[PDB]
Design a protein around this ligand. Structure first.
Ligand code: IY2
Ligand code: MG
Ligand code: ZN
Length: 314
């Protein structure tokens, strides 16, 4: 059999939650296949169809600062680490669906929020009133799955195929941060009343939703230099959207105004306190082996406080 192998450093370090997939684009497909073979199994997919699928997915990501092919693979890798360290908790179909969902979750992203598309009156806002881009991302996933030689689930029954596409749809839609706030509240109450039940499919859906938020935001769980450098790419997009909001004669929110760049450290602080820390806190409560994500989030929260006190530059 042909078994994907990684260099010695990558082989060890890919198992760590804070792994950076590196600047070599051409290695990312191999890194993804390796993660599928270990998290799912070498018999989960035909290698030729998976490779064809990977390259078609890559081609439908755009040359944008942040919401790009590197983000897709980075998000899948965070999902890999969660699956590997919680391997008894997930099903055959969930391992198949969830790495694919992560790879595909920002397909055809142009670097603009759902809000910009609504204000711009983009056709996608007419087609999908809520979770606009996320419904677009899923649609793009269905299109690619339906290309000749791209049915990577061809061995699944009709009913299993439908289940996995439903895992992928719900996982992709969960990456709408607007939905995260409600989902985390429900999970927090369920955990704290001791009512959360992983044998309940509506509960599994919420847990996978949280996992998808955690994976999508995972730049806050990297080592500080990766965290800081990724934040430049995030803001590069936010500021381009703010420019576009100004062009429509609309005041952009502060995070999207390139003139407000000196307030970034305080905005980061607000984001760690309102979104990130609660997210990885609730995830750790449910999946205790995800602890390193929360530990690394607290470490970066401390780093942003050092930037605010003038003991670090950005
Ligand atoms: C949507 N995405 C991708 C994310 O939210 C996302 C994912 N990963 N990360 C790290 C983010 C992220 O940085 N979010 C935020 C969220 C709120 N903010 C508010 C401010 C702020 C800036 C200047 C100012 F003057 C006032 C406030 N800056 C942010 C940044
Ligand atoms: Mg997205
Ligand atoms: Zn994303």
């Amino acid at each position: 059999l042909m078994q994907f192998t990684l260099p010695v450093r990558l082989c060890k370090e890919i198992e760590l939650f804070h792994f950076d997939i590196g600047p070599f684009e051409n290695m990312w497909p191999g890194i993804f296949v390796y993660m599928v073979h270990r998290s799912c199994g070498t018999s989960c997919f035909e290698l030729e169809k998976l490779c064809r699928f990977i390259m078609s997915v890559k081609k439908n990501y755009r040359r944008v600062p942040y919401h790009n092919w590197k983000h897709a693979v980075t998000v899948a890798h965070c999902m890999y680490a969660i699956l590997q360290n919680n391997h008894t908790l997930f099903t055959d179909l969930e391992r198949k669906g969830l790495l694919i969902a992560c790879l595909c979750h920002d397909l055809d992203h142009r670097g603009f929020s759902n809000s910009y598309l609504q204000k711009f009156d983009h056709p996608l806002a007419a087609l999908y009133s809520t979770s606009t881009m996320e419904q677009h991302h899923f649609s793009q996933t269905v299109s690619i799955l339906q290309l000749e030689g791209h049915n990577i689930f061809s061995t699944l029954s009709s009913s299993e195929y439908e289940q996995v596409l439903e895992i992928i749809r719900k996982a992709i839609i969960a990456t709408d941060l607007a939905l995260y706030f409600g989902n985390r509240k429900q999970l927090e109450e369920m955990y704290q009343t001791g009512s959360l039940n992983l044998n309940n499919q509506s509960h599994r859906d919420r847990v996978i939703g949280l996992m998808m938020t955690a994976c999508d935001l995972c730049s806050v769980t990297k080592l500080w230099p990766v965290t800081k450098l990724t934040a430049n790419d995030i803001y590069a997009e936010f500021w381009a959207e703010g420019d576009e909001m100004k062009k429509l004669g609309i005041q952009p929110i502060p995070m999207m105004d390139r003139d407000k760049k000196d307030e970034v450290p305080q905005g980061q602080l607000g984001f760690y306190n309102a979104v990130a820390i609660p997210c990885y806190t609730t995830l750790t409560q449910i999946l205790p082996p995800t602890e390193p994500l929360l530990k690394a989030c607290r470490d970066n929260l401390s780093q942003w406080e050092k930037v605010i006190r003038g003991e670090e530059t950005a």
